[PDB]
Amino acid sequence: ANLIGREELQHARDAVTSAQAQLDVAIQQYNANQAMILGTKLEDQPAVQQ
Amino acid sequence: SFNNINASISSINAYKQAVVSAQSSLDAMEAGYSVGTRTIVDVLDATTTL
């Protein structure tokens, strides 16, 4: 309806995109350190068997 | 009366300067809205002030 400035909407879209990027970073941080805990059971982990 | 005349001259000068200042403010607002940094509401107020 042409009420608010365009730089305000630009800054809103940029914020949403940045938040998406940060969530991707967090998900990736989780995916790593899940490669170590692949085995379901604690007694079957490679370190314990050694 | 002779003094009222000079008073009027001075007031004319002052209001001319005020008009120039309002013109400059309006132009700045219009350019900012053209590039997207301001809302249409801001432009309407500068036009009213001019």
PDB file of C-alpha atoms in Angstrom:
ATOM      1  CA  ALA A   1       0.000   0.000   0.000  1.00  0.00           C
ATOM      2  CA  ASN A   2       3.053   2.303  -0.158  1.00  0.00           C
ATOM      3  CA  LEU A   3       3.117   3.331   3.565  1.00  0.00           C
ATOM      4  CA  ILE A   4       6.658   2.506   4.945  1.00  0.00           C
ATOM      5  CA  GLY A   5      10.070   3.209   3.322  1.00  0.00           C
ATOM      6  CA  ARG A   6      11.687   0.652   1.061  1.00  0.00           C
ATOM      7  CA  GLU A   7      14.952   0.532   3.119  1.00  0.00           C
ATOM      8  CA  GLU A   8      12.881  -0.799   6.091  1.00  0.00           C
ATOM      9  CA  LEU A   9      11.590  -3.757   4.012  1.00  0.00           C
ATOM     10  CA  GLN A  10      15.053  -4.352   2.572  1.00  0.00           C
ATOM     11  CA  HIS A  11      16.443  -4.529   6.145  1.00  0.00           C
ATOM     12  CA  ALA A  12      13.658  -6.986   7.130  1.00  0.00           C
ATOM     13  CA  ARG A  13      14.417  -9.362   4.257  1.00  0.00           C
ATOM     14  CA  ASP A  14      18.145  -9.143   4.979  1.00  0.00           C
ATOM     15  CA  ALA A  15      17.484 -10.002   8.623  1.00  0.00           C
ATOM     16  CA  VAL A  16      15.443 -13.059   7.663  1.00  0.00           C
ATOM     17  CA  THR A  17      18.166 -14.292   5.310  1.00  0.00           C
ATOM     18  CA  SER A  18      20.864 -13.774   7.945  1.00  0.00           C
ATOM     19  CA  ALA A  19      18.817 -15.687  10.518  1.00  0.00           C
ATOM     20  CA  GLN A  20      18.443 -18.561   8.062  1.00  0.00           C
ATOM     21  CA  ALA A  21      22.209 -18.613   7.531  1.00  0.00           C
ATOM     22  CA  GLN A  22      22.839 -18.697  11.281  1.00  0.00           C
ATOM     23  CA  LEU A  23      20.406 -21.582  11.738  1.00  0.00           C
ATOM     24  CA  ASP A  24      22.260 -23.455   8.999  1.00  0.00           C
ATOM     25  CA  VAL A  25      25.513 -22.867  10.889  1.00  0.00           C
ATOM     26  CA  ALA A  26      23.977 -24.282  14.066  1.00  0.00           C
ATOM     27  CA  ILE A  27      22.568 -27.334  12.290  1.00  0.00           C
ATOM     28  CA  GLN A  28      25.977 -28.040  10.779  1.00  0.00           C
ATOM     29  CA  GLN A  29      27.680 -27.678  14.165  1.00  0.00           C
ATOM     30  CA  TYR A  30      25.255 -30.333  15.394  1.00  0.00           C
ATOM     31  CA  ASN A  31      25.797 -32.669  12.428  1.00  0.00           C
ATOM     32  CA  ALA A  32      29.472 -32.701  13.294  1.00  0.00           C
ATOM     33  CA  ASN A  33      29.879 -34.346  16.708  1.00  0.00           C
ATOM     34  CA  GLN A  34      27.038 -36.612  15.574  1.00  0.00           C
ATOM     35  CA  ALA A  35      29.533 -38.502  13.410  1.00  0.00           C
ATOM     36  CA  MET A  36      31.338 -39.546  16.599  1.00  0.00           C
ATOM     37  CA  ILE A  37      28.153 -40.810  18.275  1.00  0.00           C
ATOM     38  CA  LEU A  38      26.878 -42.801  15.301  1.00  0.00           C
ATOM     39  CA  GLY A  39      26.804 -46.069  17.234  1.00  0.00           C
ATOM     40  CA  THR A  40      23.569 -46.305  19.181  1.00  0.00           C
ATOM     41  CA  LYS A  41      24.905 -48.061  22.294  1.00  0.00           C
ATOM     42  CA  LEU A  42      27.598 -46.788  24.649  1.00  0.00           C
ATOM     43  CA  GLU A  43      29.159 -50.233  25.040  1.00  0.00           C
ATOM     44  CA  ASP A  44      29.646 -50.572  21.265  1.00  0.00           C
ATOM     45  CA  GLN A  45      31.567 -47.331  20.714  1.00  0.00           C
ATOM     46  CA  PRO A  46      35.049 -47.651  19.145  1.00  0.00           C
ATOM     47  CA  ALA A  47      36.848 -45.995  22.055  1.00  0.00           C
ATOM     48  CA  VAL A  48      35.409 -48.309  24.718  1.00  0.00           C
ATOM     49  CA  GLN A  49      36.191 -51.497  22.800  1.00  0.00           C
ATOM     50  CA  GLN A  50      39.871 -50.568  22.499  1.00  0.00           C
TER      51      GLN A  50
ATOM     52  CA  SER B   1       4.213  54.082  10.491  1.00  0.00           C
ATOM     53  CA  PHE B   2       7.727  54.903   9.329  1.00  0.00           C
ATOM     54  CA  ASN B   3       9.032  52.207  11.673  1.00  0.00           C
ATOM     55  CA  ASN B   4       6.395  49.617  10.745  1.00  0.00           C
ATOM     56  CA  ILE B   5       7.691  49.837   7.173  1.00  0.00           C
ATOM     57  CA  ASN B   6      11.195  48.713   8.147  1.00  0.00           C
ATOM     58  CA  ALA B   7       9.788  46.002  10.403  1.00  0.00           C
ATOM     59  CA  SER B   8       7.951  44.617   7.373  1.00  0.00           C
ATOM     60  CA  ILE B   9      11.132  44.662   5.281  1.00  0.00           C
ATOM     61  CA  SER B  10      12.976  42.613   7.899  1.00  0.00           C
ATOM     62  CA  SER B  11      10.139  40.100   8.234  1.00  0.00           C
ATOM     63  CA  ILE B  12      10.124  39.639   4.454  1.00  0.00           C
ATOM     64  CA  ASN B  13      13.825  38.783   4.540  1.00  0.00           C
ATOM     65  CA  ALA B  14      13.334  36.264   7.347  1.00  0.00           C
ATOM     66  CA  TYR B  15      10.434  34.480   5.660  1.00  0.00           C
ATOM     67  CA  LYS B  16      12.322  34.293   2.361  1.00  0.00           C
ATOM     68  CA  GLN B  17      15.112  32.463   4.179  1.00  0.00           C
ATOM     69  CA  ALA B  18      12.571  30.142   5.802  1.00  0.00           C
ATOM     70  CA  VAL B  19      11.126  29.292   2.382  1.00  0.00           C
ATOM     71  CA  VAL B  20      14.572  28.419   1.027  1.00  0.00           C
ATOM     72  CA  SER B  21      15.228  26.150   4.015  1.00  0.00           C
ATOM     73  CA  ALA B  22      11.901  24.351   3.586  1.00  0.00           C
ATOM     74  CA  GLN B  23      12.632  23.849  -0.117  1.00  0.00           C
ATOM     75  CA  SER B  24      15.956  22.209   0.714  1.00  0.00           C
ATOM     76  CA  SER B  25      14.374  19.919   3.305  1.00  0.00           C
ATOM     77  CA  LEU B  26      11.683  18.838   0.839  1.00  0.00           C
ATOM     78  CA  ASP B  27      14.232  18.063  -1.868  1.00  0.00           C
ATOM     79  CA  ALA B  28      16.294  15.961   0.536  1.00  0.00           C
ATOM     80  CA  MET B  29      13.202  14.031   1.610  1.00  0.00           C
ATOM     81  CA  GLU B  30      12.152  13.436  -1.995  1.00  0.00           C
ATOM     82  CA  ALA B  31      15.552  12.097  -3.057  1.00  0.00           C
ATOM     83  CA  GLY B  32      15.720   9.859   0.005  1.00  0.00           C
ATOM     84  CA  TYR B  33      12.313   8.410  -0.809  1.00  0.00           C
ATOM     85  CA  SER B  34      13.359   7.964  -4.438  1.00  0.00           C
ATOM     86  CA  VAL B  35      16.279   5.786  -3.315  1.00  0.00           C
ATOM     87  CA  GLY B  36      14.133   3.986  -0.731  1.00  0.00           C
ATOM     88  CA  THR B  37      15.376   5.373   2.593  1.00  0.00           C
ATOM     89  CA  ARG B  38      12.081   7.107   3.500  1.00  0.00           C
ATOM     90  CA  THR B  39       8.363   6.304   3.561  1.00  0.00           C
ATOM     91  CA  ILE B  40       5.763   8.259   1.548  1.00  0.00           C
ATOM     92  CA  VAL B  41       4.462   9.697   4.826  1.00  0.00           C
ATOM     93  CA  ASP B  42       7.732  11.566   5.348  1.00  0.00           C
ATOM     94  CA  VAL B  43       7.450  13.216   1.927  1.00  0.00           C
ATOM     95  CA  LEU B  44       3.915  14.438   2.619  1.00  0.00           C
ATOM     96  CA  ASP B  45       5.021  16.270   5.765  1.00  0.00           C
ATOM     97  CA  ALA B  46       7.824  18.153   4.002  1.00  0.00           C
ATOM     98  CA  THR B  47       5.390  19.283   1.316  1.00  0.00           C
ATOM     99  CA  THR B  48       3.074  20.575   4.043  1.00  0.00           C
ATOM    100  CA  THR B  49       5.923  22.433   5.747  1.00  0.00           C
ATOM    101  CA  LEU B  50       6.923  24.090   2.470  1.00  0.00           C
TER     102      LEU B  50
END
